Amino acid sequence: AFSELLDQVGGLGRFQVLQTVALVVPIMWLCTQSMLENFSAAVPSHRCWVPLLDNSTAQASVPGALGPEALLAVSIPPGPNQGPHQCRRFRQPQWQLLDPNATATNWSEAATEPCVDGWVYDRSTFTSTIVAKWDLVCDSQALKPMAQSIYLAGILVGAAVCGPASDRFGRRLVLTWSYLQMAVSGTAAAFAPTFPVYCLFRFLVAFAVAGVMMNTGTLVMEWTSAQARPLVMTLNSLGFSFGHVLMAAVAYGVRDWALLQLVVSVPFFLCFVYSCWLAESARWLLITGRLDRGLRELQRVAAINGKRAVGDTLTPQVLLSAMQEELSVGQAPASLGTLLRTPGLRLRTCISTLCWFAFGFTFFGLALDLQALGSNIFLLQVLIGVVDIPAKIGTLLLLSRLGRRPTQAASLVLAGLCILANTLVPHEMGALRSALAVLGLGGLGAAFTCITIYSGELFPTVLRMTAVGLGQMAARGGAILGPLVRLLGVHGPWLPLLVYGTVPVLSGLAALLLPET
Ligand SMILES: CCc1oc2ccccc2c1C(=O)c1cc(Br)c(O)c(Br)c1
Description:
- The two termini are 26 Å apart.
- This protein folds into three domains: 1-43 and 133-331, MFS general substrate transporter like domains (Growth Hormone, Chain: A, Up-down Bundle); 46-121, no CATH class; 334-517, MFS general substrate transporter like domains (Growth Hormone, Chain: A, Up-down Bundle), CATH 1.20.1250.
- The strands form three sheets. It has a two-stranded antiparallel ribbon. The protein has a two-stranded antiparallel sheet with strand order 2-3. A two-stranded antiparallel ribbon has the order 4-5.
- It is built from 25 helices and six strands.
- 68% of the residues lie in helices and 3% in strands.
- The protein is elongated, with a radius of gyration of 27 Å.
- It is mainly alpha-helical.
- It is classed as transport protein.
- The entry lists the keywords Membrane protein, membrane transporter, transport protein.
- It forms a monomeric assembly.
- The entry is titled "Structure of URAT1 in complex with benzbromarone".
- The protein is urat1.
């Protein structure tokens, strides 16, 4: 098997460290790409465009000066939920509301009119956003979630198209192409003049994100020992956790959505540049039937590891003899039908995927709309990343010490309970709300590594990959379904959070059924 070749060549040497660092670095920026939506697509307060305020001629026509606060009351109906109406304007100016008495029900909807001239957004915190540019407000409010869904749709498509491709052309080639596609698509989306064009380039960016993620995952775990695999994943996950901290650093500097996207998607040009000086997986070359390339790559890895003589001793005969087990009897991937045929495994599978979905649905429903969780988004963005790392290390320590099943159940249950508690406390006590939201997101980050490590060992080795793929697809499908739930928020902001908090609790409670180890 290739394990003998890896042992002969290395496994935990200089080359592994260098390649791991190089592959880990881009995941921060990949996280930034996904988490862009919070700052690029922020929704500011949108008053209606009123002639008597913006047009200076009309305002100056009246003798004397009238305060903006008092002048607004004559041309904007008092809106629902304690604010000036964000989608209606008075048909004619009304001075009754001004001087003597205040009309609660008199400012009825009969005299109102839709925003014919457009809206006037607030630029105090964000210079520009996608919502302001294309007026994704009032009747078009549903467009913002949909767009997000479309982005998360691309992730579902990319993994469905970059998987069979990576097994035909090679992992590193597809990874390089994905870096280039990311850079180009981001730069194009920065300049999108129309809304469908921006959505299309966002879909392409999601495609490239999926390709990069899967190729990196396959590359790191094919050049390292099987004993270090549990550790490797964490190094990848922790890298993503740093993106949060980076995002808040970038968003706090540039407040224009176009410049934000351009800054985010530029480094991937450098990533594509240095992608050339990387290592193609020797396992794929050897099993596919390309022995010259595999031998040269293995000798290169041996030279980097510092053992030139050992690398030189390798010959085609030894390589063929060592790899006969995998090549002589080709292990074709066990069909999903075969995995679902066995009565014994069914209970294990149905629960397992149920966890994946529960994580994917709940995370992307809460992460992308971070405004509802707290008061300001910069502090929440920083704190999510700051708290994920201790959580993601404590989960590994508990898995080593405590059983996997209790940890898997507890993480999901606590995350769901934290979200449920967060949605109940009054908005006045912002500190409690923010802390509970941060802790829930941290618990979800913990559950990610817990389930990723655990699901591998549940099923036999023959059908393990099929089960992992099924779980990953379930996570992506729940991710697509996540944002659409926010449309229910019209009935009230509490319902989406109630759903997002209820799903993880049930998933965690069900996770107790599946066996330990
Ligand atoms: C469903 C698979 C998927 O595709 C993405 C594309 C961009 C950003 C995140 C993801 C993502 C995740 O769910 C995810 C969540 C956490 Br937490 C991680 O630490 C890592 Br690594 C990945």
